Design a protein around this ligand. Sequence first.
Ligand SMILES: CCCCCCCCCCCCCCCCCC(=O)OC[C@H](COP(=O)([O-])OC[C@H](O)COP(=O)([O-])OC[C@H](COC(=O)CCCCCCCCCCCCCCCCC)OC(=O)CCCCCCCCCCCCCCCCC)OC(=O)CCCCCCCCCCCCCCCCC
Ligand SMILES: CCCCCCCCCCCCCCCCCC(=O)OC[C@H](COP(=O)([O-])OCC[N+](C)(C)C)OC(=O)CCCCCCCCCCCCCCCCC
Ligand SMILES: CCCCCCCCCCCCCCCCCC(=O)OC[C@H](COP(=O)(O)OCCN)OC(=O)CCCCCCCCCCCCCCCCC
Lengths: 177, 99, 459, 128, 155, 87, 606, 48
Amino acid sequence: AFLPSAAYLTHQQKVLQLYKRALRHLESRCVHRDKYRYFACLLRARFDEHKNEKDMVKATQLLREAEKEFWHGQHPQPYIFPESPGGTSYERYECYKVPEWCLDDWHPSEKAMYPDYFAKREQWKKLRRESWEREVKQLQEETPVGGPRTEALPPARKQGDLPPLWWHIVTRPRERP
Amino acid sequence: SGYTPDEKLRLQQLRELRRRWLKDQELSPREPVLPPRRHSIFAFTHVLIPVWIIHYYLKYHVTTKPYTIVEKKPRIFPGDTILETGEVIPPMKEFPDQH
Amino acid sequence: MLKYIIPTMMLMPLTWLSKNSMIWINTTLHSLLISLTSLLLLNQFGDNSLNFSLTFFSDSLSTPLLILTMWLLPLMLMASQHHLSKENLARKKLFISMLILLQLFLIMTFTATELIFFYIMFEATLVPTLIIITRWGNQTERLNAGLYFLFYTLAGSLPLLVALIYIQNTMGSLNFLILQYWVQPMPNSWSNTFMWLACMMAFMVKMPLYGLHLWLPKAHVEAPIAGSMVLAAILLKLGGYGMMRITLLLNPITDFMAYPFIMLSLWGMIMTSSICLRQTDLKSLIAYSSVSHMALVIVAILIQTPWSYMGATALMIAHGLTSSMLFCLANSNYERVHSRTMILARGLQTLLPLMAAWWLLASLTNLALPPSINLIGELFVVMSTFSWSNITIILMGLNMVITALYSLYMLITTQRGKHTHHINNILPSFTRENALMSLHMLPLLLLSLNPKIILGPLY
Amino acid sequence: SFPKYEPSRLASLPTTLDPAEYDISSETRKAQAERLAIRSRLKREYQLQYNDPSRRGVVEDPALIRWTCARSANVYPNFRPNTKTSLLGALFGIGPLIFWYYVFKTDRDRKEKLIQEGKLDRTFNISY
Amino acid sequence: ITKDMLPGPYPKTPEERAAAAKKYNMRVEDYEPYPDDGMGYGDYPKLPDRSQQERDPWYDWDHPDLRLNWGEPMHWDLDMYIRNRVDTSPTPVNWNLMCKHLFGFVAFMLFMFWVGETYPTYQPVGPKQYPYNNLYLERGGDPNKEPEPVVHYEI
Amino acid sequence: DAPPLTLEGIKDRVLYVLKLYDKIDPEKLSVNSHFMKDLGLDSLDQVEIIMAMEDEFGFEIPDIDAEKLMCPQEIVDYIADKKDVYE
Amino acid sequence: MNLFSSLTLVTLILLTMPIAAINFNTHKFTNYPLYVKTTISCAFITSMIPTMMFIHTGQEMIISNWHWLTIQTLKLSLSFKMDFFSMMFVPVALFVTWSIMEFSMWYMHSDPNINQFFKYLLLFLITMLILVTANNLFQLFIGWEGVGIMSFLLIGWWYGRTDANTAALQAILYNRIGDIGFILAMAWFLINLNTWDLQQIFMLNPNDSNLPLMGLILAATGKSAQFGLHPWLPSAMEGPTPVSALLHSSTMVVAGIFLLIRFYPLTENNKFGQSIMLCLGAMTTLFTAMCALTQNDIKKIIAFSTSSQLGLMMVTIGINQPHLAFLHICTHAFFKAMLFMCSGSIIHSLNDEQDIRKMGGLFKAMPFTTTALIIGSLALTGMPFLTGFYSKDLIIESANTSYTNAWALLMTLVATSFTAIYSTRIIFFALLGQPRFPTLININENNPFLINSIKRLLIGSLFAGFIISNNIPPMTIPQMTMPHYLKMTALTVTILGFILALEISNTTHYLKFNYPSNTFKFSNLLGYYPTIMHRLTPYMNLTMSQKSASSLLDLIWLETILPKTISLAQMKMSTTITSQKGLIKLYFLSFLITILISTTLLNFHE
Amino acid sequence: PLNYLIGGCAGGLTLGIGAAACAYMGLTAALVKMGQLEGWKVFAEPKV
Ligand SMILES: CCCCCCCCCCCCCCCCCC(=O)OC[C@H](COP(=O)([O-])OC[C@H](O)COP(=O)([O-])OC[C@H](COC(=O)CCCCCCCCCCCCCCCCC)OC(=O)CCCCCCCCCCCCCCCCC)OC(=O)CCCCCCCCCCCCCCCCC
Ligand SMILES: CCCCCCCCCCCCCCCCCC(=O)OC[C@H](COP(=O)([O-])OCC[N+](C)(C)C)OC(=O)CCCCCCCCCCCCCCCCC
Ligand SMILES: CCCCCCCCCCCCCCCCCC(=O)OC[C@H](COP(=O)(O)OCCN)OC(=O)CCCCCCCCCCCCCCCCC
C-alpha cells in the first residue's frame, strides 16, 4: 500500500506482517514469557497448518479472515517499543538533533575551540563539493526517460566516485547527540 | 527474498562513509582548546545579608505604616498572666469530674 | 505640547542632512532622546488634566499613548533598517520621513483639545501609513490592502465630520474641556440615533469592530515591519481614544444603542480567536489576534464604567507593546525563510534559543499572564462586563481559553517540534533583533511594577 | 460472530479490514505504479535540490505555497452565492448575534427592573 | 511560483480537470475536487480526510514530523490533522459503542448521586447541642437585643 | 546508564541469540550463514529471528527492513546503522 | 513578630536569589543544580522556624508589605497570609522539592540543558509559594497561572517530541477552563463584596454564595484533575519524571484542593456547594481508580492514583472537613512523590522502559527501590500508623459518620478497595515474578543522590504523618465514637481489595487465553472520555473555525456585503453612464428630456 | 420606519440584486418615514 521501494505489499509479506503483529499483540495479551511461549507455539501451529495452500484465492481468504480474527483478538494497549513510533521515548531527543550546517555559522572565536575538527570539516565539505557534480551526472545517465520509476537510489559503480545523494544520510545527527 | 545487489552495494558504501563520519565526530586530545582565563560564604551572602535587608525593611518601612503587619492576638487561657498588666486570668469553674 | 512637536519636526532636517551611512544612527539617537523627554507628560493630577494651551492638553488617557508613540519610532527605525539596506538613499530618507511625519500626526492627534483638529490629525495619520504600505509593502496585493484601508477609514470618518460640525453649530465649541461642562443629555430619537452612529462608526472601523475588520488582515499582512508595528500599536488605538473622547457627548443614548455593537464585539472576540486557531500565515495570526483583543476594548468603552475604562486603556497600552513585539518576531523569521507561512520553518528553539525565549515572553504576554498589564486590562474589562451582565463571563472565559490556545499554538508551531530539514539559511540572532525584542518586552515588564501610569483619567 | 468495525469520520477503517486492499487486479497495479512514479519523480526532484552544496536557503515546495494560496487567496474568486451557503451564512453569521442579543437584553431588563423596584441585593456593591 | 501553478476555478471539462490534476501533482482519476457549491475551494483536491498519525512512520519522509512529502498535495485541513492536534486514527472499539458506554456510565452515576442525595446516610444521634442559646453572641447576634432561651437539659 | 555498543558486541549477541534457537545447530552458524539458502530455515522462522533481535536490542525493526535482512551480518550492520556504533 | 515575618520573607527571597544568579550568568557553572538544591534545603531550614513558632503559640499574621495599586476602592497590596495552611504547606513543599531536586541531579544528568531544567523547577516552586501564601485573589491568580505556565514548560521539556507538546497544550486547555471559574469567582467577589482580600470575604460572609463557590469548584476541577476536566493529568506524564513527581503528584495538582480549603468559612455555610464537592470528588475517585486497574504504563497508573487521591480530598472537603483534607495534602506529598521517584529509578535502571509488562524480577535486583516502593504502596493504601493512616483513615471515619450522600460514601469505599488493587498491581508487575526486560542488564542505583533523595522522603513517609498530626492544633471535633463495623471499614475494604487483587494476580500465571471484555476495554482505553472528547470537541472548534468562521464569514460573507456588493454597484454604474457612443445627437437629446422633466414635471418655471 | 423597511425590501424582490436591494431600497425607504417623523430636509432652505 505505502512503501519506499515498491508500491504494494505482496501476499507473502501480508502473511508475515500478520504473523508478527499477531505475536506482538499476543505477547501484550500474554505478559508472562512462558505462557506467551505456549500460546505462541499454538498460534505458530495455527499459521503452519495452512502453510501449503496452493490456491491463491483460498490463501487470500484465509489471510483475510485471519485479519478478522486478529482484529477481534487484539490488545487494546499493545506494548510499543519506547523509541518506536507510539512509544514513550519516541522522538524525545529531536530537540538535541541540531543539523550539521549550524557549525558553519559559528563565530571564529568558538571555531578556534576545535581546530582539528573544523580542519577536518573543511576536507569533508571538500569531498562533498567535488563529489556532487559527478554524482549528479551519474543520476542523469541512469534515470530512464519519463523520470525515475521507483524511489530506490543507485549506488556508485566506479572507483573514486561516491554514491549519489549521500550527504544528508552520512552527516545525519546521532540518536544521542 | 532479501536485498538486491545494488541495494547491498549502496548500503555498504553509505555504511563505510557513515562510519568514517561517526569516527571523525570524535575529539582530539587538545580539543577543547580553552582560552586563557570564604568557607561558609553561602550562609552569609544568601541568608545573613537578606535577613539584614528584610529585617531593616520590615522594621523601619513596613511596621512604621499602619495595618501592614497585622498579627492575630495571642491565645489567652485561664491561668495566664498578661505581660502588659500582670492580672492573672482566673481559672475555670471546678469540673464535674467524670473518671 | 510644542516641546515635543518641534523636536519631531527637527527630525526631518536631522534625517535629510545626514551622511549616507549615518541616517539610521542619528534618527535612532534623537528619537530615543525625544522618547526620553516624553516622560515629562506624567505631571498629572487627581482632579485636573494637564492643560497646556488652547490647542493642546494631555490627560491620563493620552499620556501613555504619547509615551508609546514617541517610544515606537526608534523601534521602527531599528526594525526597518535591514530590509531597506539595499534601498536607494533618497527612498530610504523618504521612508524615515514618512515615519517621522506619522509620529508628528499622532502626537497631536492624542493631544487635540478641539475635536475637529482631532479629526484632521486623525485622518492625516492615514496618508503616511498609506505610503508605507503601498510603497514599501512586499507582495502583489499591497495595493488592494491600502485601497480597502483608505476606503474603510474614510467612509467611516465621513459621517463623523458632519457630526462634529453639527456639535460645533449646536453647542458652540468642540473643545473637550468646554464640552465636559456643556454636555446635554442626548434623548431617544432617530436624528440622535444617526448622530450616535455618525459619531461612533468611524472609530468602530478604526478599532476594528467585528464585521468592519476586513481591512486589517490585509493592511497588516501586506505592510512592511514599521507599518505593521505602528498599525497594531497606535493606529488601532486611535479608535479607542476617539471613543473615550466622544462617548462624553453620547449619553444616555449609548445605554440602549450600544447593545448590537456589544453583541458584535463579544461574539467577534470568539470568532476572530477561532480564526487565529486556523491561520497558516503568522502575520495574519497576529492581525486577527489584534482584532480579538481590541474587541474587548470596544466592549469596555461601550459599557462605560470606571473599571472598564481603566482596563481598556491598560489593555490598549499592553496590546500595543505585545503586538509590536510579535510582528517584530514574525519579521525576524521572515528575514530568514522569506515566507510568512507558519508551518514552514519549525523547531526554531533548536537553532535560536534566546529568540525562542523572546517568543515565549511575547506569547505569555499575549495570553494575559499575571501580573502583566495585559492581564490587568483583560481582568478589569472582565470585571466590568460581569457587573454589566453576569452571563457575559461565559464569553469572556471562553475567549481567554481560545486566546491561550492560539498563543501557545503559535509558540509550538514556530518554536518547537522537529526543525525543517530543507531550510539551512537560519542565521544566528543578530544583536539588532534581540535589541528590538528587549526594547519591546522590558518596558512592558517594567510597567507591571508601577501600573498606575497606564490606567487612564479615572484611576 | 465478531463485531464488524464501524468506520466513522473520527475513526477511519484500518488497512487490515479494508476489502479493496487485497485486489490484485491490474488496474490497481497500474494505479499504484503510477502513483509510485509520481512520488518517485517528486522525491528525486526534492533531493536534487536538498543535497546541493551550492544551495543555502529554502527548498521551496509549490504544494505548500499552493496550500496557503488556497487557504487564503482563492476563496472569493471561486465563491458562488447559492442556497446552501446563504442559509449557512444567515444560520451561523447573524444567528448567534441575535441569540446573545435576546439573552443579554432579557438579563439586563430583568436586572434593571429588579434594581429600580428595590429588590436586588446591592449592599456592598460600590465597584462597577 | 507562477500563475498556472496556483489554485484556480472549478473544472467542468475533462481537459481542465487534467490540467488541474497535473498542476496538483496527482493522477486524474484520484483527483477529486470539492463539490462546486460555493464553499470557496475551487479546484482544490479532496484528500481522503485522514490524520497524519495513520501515515507509515518508518518511511523516510521529506517532512518527518508532518509525515508529508515534497510536492505531495496537502489536505485542506493539513494544519488541523497534524499529530499535535485531532487524531482520526482507527480505534479498537467502534465510535457508537464508546459513546453508548461513556454516556450510560456518566448518566447512571449522576442519577445514583441524585438518589443518594434524596436518601442520605446519617447517625443515630440528635443535633449537636450548643450553649448560650445556640451561641447567639458568637454567631454575630446583636448584644442590644436578647433572643429566645435555647435551654438544653440532661439525658 | 546505556553502555556503548560495538560491532563485536552486536555480533556476539546476535550469534548468541541464534545459538539459542533449536532450529540452528551451533557449528553450522556463521556470520554470513544465509537463513533460507544456507541454514534451511523458513520465512516465518526468519521473522521470529528478527523478533528475537528486537527483544534483544530493545527496538523495533520495521517490516520493510525486516524482510530484507536474510543473514546475521546484515542484521548486525542494520543495528549498527540504527544505533550509530563506532562513533 | 520580628523573627516570624523576617524568616517568612527570607524563605521566598532566598528562593528568588538563584533566579537572579542564573539570569546574570557569565561563566560555566560549578554545579548550579547543587546550588539550587542547597538553596532550597536552606529555604526549608529557614521556613521551619515560623512553623515552630506557629506550633508554640498559634501565631498567625499577614505581611501587607508593599502597596501596589489602588483602583478606587480596592487597595491591592503585596499581602502574604501566614496561617495554618501556609505554615504547614511551605516546609512540606520545600522538603519534597529538595528531595525531587537531589533526585533530578541523578536522573537528568545526561541533559546538557540541566541548568534550564533547575531554573524552571525553581520557578515552579516560586509560583506555588506565591499561590499558597497569597492573601488576595489577584496574587493567588498570579501563583495559579504561574503553576499552569510552568506546567506547560515542564511537560514540554522535550519539545521536539510531538506528543509532549500535545499534552502541554492539553494541560493548558483544561487549566484555562478552570480559570473561567476562577475569574468568575474573582468577579463575584469584586462586584458583591468589594474585595479580593480574604479577610473582608471572611468578615462579610454572604449567604447567597452559590455562584462564586461554583466558580471555585470549576477552578479546582481544572487544577486538581476532577471529573470532566481530568484527562490532562495522565497525559501530563509525557514530561520528565521529576516534573511529574514534583508538580503533578504533590505540589501543583493540590492547588484546587488548597483553593477550596482556603475558602472553608464560605463552604461551611453552604450545603449545596458541599454536596457538589462530595458528588464530584466521589465520581473522580471512582472513575480514575477504576481506570487505573488495567493501564500498562506505570506513570499513567501513578497519575490515576494521585487523581483518585485528589478526588478523596475533594470528598473530605465536601463533608465539611477542610483540615483533614489539608492534612491529607501534606501526607500525600511524601509517599506519592516517593512512588514517582521509585518508578523513575526503575525506568532509568531499565533504559526508558515505562511499561509494567516488561518489568518484574526486581525484588532483589533493586532492593532499595523495592523497599521504598512497597513502603509507598502501604502508605497509599492505608497501612496502620504509616503516614497515610493519620489522614486517610480519619477521612473515611469522618465520611462514614456524617449527614452524607450515601452513594458518594459507597463509591469512596469502592475507590478505597481499588487503591489496594492497583498498588499490588504495581508491586506485582513491577517487582514480583521473573524478569521481562531485555537481556542487557543496566540495573544500578548506587548513587548517594538517588539514595538520599528517596531516603529523606522514606523517613518522611514513615514518621511525618505521626509528627504532623500530633503537631497540628485541633480545628474540628473528631468523631471517635462509632460502631465496630463502621470503625474498621476502611481497613476491611482495603484488605478485601488486596485479597481480590491477589486472586487477579494469581489468575495471570494460568495457561488460559481469555478474549477481552467490555469492562477491560473501558478501563484500558481510559474510560473512552480521553478518546471521544479529544476527537469530537477538537473537531468542532477546528472546522467551525474555518468553514463557519474563517472561510465563511471573513473571506466570503462579510467580504460580500461590505466591500464588494458596494464596489460592484459603482463599477457597473460607470459602464451604464460612461457607455456614451460619442455621438452629438445622443448628447443633446439627453439635454432635451431634461427640459421636458425640469419644466413640466418638476415645476421649476414658477 | 419598519413598515417601509418591509415594503422597500419587497420592492427589491420585484426589482429584477434581490436581497441586495432589500438592504438598499428598504434602507432608503426607512429614511423617508424617519424624515417625515423628525423633519429631515435634504433641500434645506438657506437660513443663516
Ligand atoms: C525598576 C527596577 C527593576 C529591577 C528588577 C527587574 C524587574 C523585572 C524586569 C525584567 C526581568 C527579566 C528580564 C530578562 C529576561 C528576558 C530575557 C531572557 O530570558 O534572557 C535570558 C538570560 C539568561 O538566560 P540564558 O541561559 O543566557 O539564555 C536563555 C535561553 O535562551 C533559554 O531561555 P529560557 O526560556 O530558559 O528563559 C526565558 C525564561 C522564561 O520563563 C518563563 O517562561 C517563566 C516565567 C513565568 C512564570 C513565573 C513567573 C510568574 C509571575 C510571578 C513572579 C512575578 C511577581 C512576584 C511578586 C510576588 C507575587 C505577586 O525567562 C526568564 O528566565 C526570565 C525570568 C523572569 C521572568 C519574569 C516574568 C516573565 C513572564 C511573562 C510576564 C509575566 C507577567 C509580568 C511579570 C513582571 C515581573 C516584574 O537573561 C539575561 O541575560 C538577563 C539580562 C538582564 C535583565 C535585566 C532586566 C531589567 C531591565 C530593565 C532596565 C531598566 C530598570 C533597571 C533594572 C536593572 C535590573 C538589573
Ligand atoms: C541584593 C540587593 C538588595 C537591595 C540593596 C539596596 C538596599 C539595601 C538594604 C536596605 C533596605 C532599603 C530600605 C527599605 C526599602 C525601601 C522601603 C520603601 O519605603 O519602599 C517604598 C515602597 C513601599 O511601598 P509604599 O506603600 O511605600 O509605596 C506604594 C507606592 N505609592 C505610595 C506611590 C502608591 O516600595 C517598595 O518597597 C518596593 C519593593 C517591591 C518588592 C516586591 C516586588 C514585586 C515584584 C512584582 C510586582 C507586581 C506585583 C503584583 C501583585 C501585587 C499584589 C496583588
Ligand atoms: C465543577 C463542574 C465541572 C464540570 C465538568 C464537565 C463540563 C466540561 C467538559 C469538558 C469540556 C472540555 C473538554 C473537551 C475538549 C478537549 C480538548 C483537548 O484537550 O483535546 C486533546 C487533544 C489531544 O489528545 P490526544 O489525541 O489524546 O493526544 C495524543 C498525543 N498525540 O488535543 C488536540 O486535539 C489539540 C486541539 C487544540 C485546540 C482545541 C480546541 C478546543 C477548545 C475547547 C474549549 C472549551 C470551552 C468550555 C467553556 C465552558 C464555559 C462554562
